[PDB]
């Protein structure tokens, strides 16, 4: 499928950012030819809130840099393991 | 452009393989929804022919693994620098 391919690229890109423990949730949708996405990543529970927010920002930068059709990407974090 | 995006992904993927000194040539075309491509990479002139052929095979694996719509990719090598 069309959107399977883009979603697999998003997940892959996110999972390669240091401190990501899996993609918990990804909602990606077409707005014209652009993708708008919302994502939840897992992080180490003992990371600080400041570190988890840095990880989110690094995921946003990595994913947006690799998948050019993404025009909006909201990343938040949840404790995992 | 449509094909600019895929071609930039191909080049980027190739350039991240150890021993690639630039993409010299890339011809990529649609055959239905699949891409068929031919590429020339630069390599160190003092690599052996056996090493250059390993690099080509590594580029083929890397690019094909990252860009799922590619169904044929022919890689050869030319001395660069």
Swiss-Prot record, chains A, B:
Effect of residue 49 to W: Significantly reduced magnetic response, many fewer, much smaller magnetite crystals formed, still stabilizes MamB, CTD dimerizes, binds fewer cations
Residues engaged in binding Fe cation 1: 38, 74
UniProt-annotated location(s): Magnetosome membrane; Cell inner membrane
Consequence of changing residue 39 to L: CTD behaves like wild-type
Induction profile: Part of the probable 17 gene mamAB operon.
Outcome after substituting residue 49 to P: CTD dimerizes, binds fewer cations. Loss of magnetic response, still stabilizes MamB
Result for mutant: residue 74 to A: Wild-type magnetic response, no change in magnetite crystal size, number or shape
Residue sites binding Fe cation 3 per the record: 78
Disruption phenotype: Single gene disruption has no growth defects, no accumulation of magnetite, forms empty intracellular magnetosome vesicles, decreased levels of MamB, mislocation of MamC in 1-3 foci or rarely in a shortened chain. Magnetosome vesicles are fewer and smaller, aligned in a chain with the filament, only a few have very small crystals. Other, possibly precursor magnetosome vesicles are visible. MamI mislocalized to cell inner membrane or in 1 to a few patches.
UniProt-annotated binding residues for Fe cation 2: 53
Effect the entry attributes to changing residue 49 to R: Loss of magnetic response, still stabilizes MamB, CTD dimerizes, binds cations, dimer interface is tighter and twisted
Region (C-terminal domain (CTD)) location: 4-81
Subunit architecture: Forms homodimers via its C-terminal domain (CTD) in the presence of metal cations. Interacts with MamB via their CTD. Isolated CTD forms homodimers.
Protein family: Belongs to the cation diffusion facilitator (CDF) transporter (TC 2.A.4) family.
Domain observations: The C-terminal domain (CTD) is probably responsible for hetero- and homodimerization; it assumes a V-shaped, dimeric metallo-chaperone-like fold that can open and close. Val-49 forms the hinge between the dimers. Binds up to 3 divalent metal cations (probably iron in vivo); upon binding there is a conformational shift to a tighter dimer. If the CTD cannot fold correctly the function of the whole protein is decreased, suggesting the CTD confers functionality on the transmembrane domain (TMD), perhaps activated by ligand binding to the CTD.
Comment field (misc): This bacteria makes up to 60 cubo-octahedral magnetosomes of about 45 nm in diameter which contain membrane-bound crystals of magnetite (Fe(3)O(4)). Expression of just the minimal mamAB gene cluster (MGMSRv2__2365 to MGMSRv2__2381), including this gene, is sufficient to form a minimal magnetosome chain with small magnetite particles.
Biological function: Essential for magnetosome formation; required for stable accumulation of MamB. May nucleate iron crystal formation. Probably binds and transports iron. Binds divalent cations, possibly up to 3 Zn(2+) per dimer in vitro, probably iron in vivo. One of 7 genes (mamLQBIEMO) able to induce magnetosome membrane biogenesis; coexpression of mamLQRBIEMO in a deletion of the 17 gene mamAB operon restores magnetosome vesicle formation but not magnetite biosynthesis.
Name recorded for this polypeptide: Magnetosome protein MamM
Organism: Magnetospirillum gryphiswaldense (strain DSM 6361 / JCM 21280 / NBRC 15271 / MSR-1)
């Amino acid at each position: 499928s069309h959107m399977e391919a883009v979603q697999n690229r998003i997940v892959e890109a996110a999972e390669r950012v240091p401190g990501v423990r899996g993609v918990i949730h990804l909602r990606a949708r077409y707005v014209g030819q652009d993708i708008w996405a919302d994502m939840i990543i897992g992080v180490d529970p003992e990371n600080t809130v400041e570190q988890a927010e840095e990880i989110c920002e690094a995921v946003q930068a990595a994913v947006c840099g690799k998948i050019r059709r993404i025009e909006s990407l909201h990343v938040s974090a949840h404790a995992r393991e």
